[PDB]
């Protein structure tokens, strides 16, 4: 009963699965990015090395 | 950083085409300004240091 009147004071008031599904794709996606940024970045001061 | 990357390449390029002309200019140059006159200026005033 208070749980459904928690209802009724929450969602009265006021995704997910794809939140967390996305969130964990999108880390993996910036762990990509930051690989990215290391092999460009680094690539970059070889050549403006060179 | 990938725009940077095509710009400081685009510098390479050049850089590259740069020093490859530098360096075809400075061997030529020390060929003929070195050699020629320790050779020239040499043979020539020891011809003369021959001849006259």
Redo the contacts between chains.
Sequence with gaps: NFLKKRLLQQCETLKMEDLTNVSSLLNMERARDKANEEGLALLQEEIDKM | ??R??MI??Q??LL?LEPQLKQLQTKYDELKERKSSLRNAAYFLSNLKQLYQ
């Design positions: 950083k990938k940077q990357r400081e390449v510098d390479e850089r």
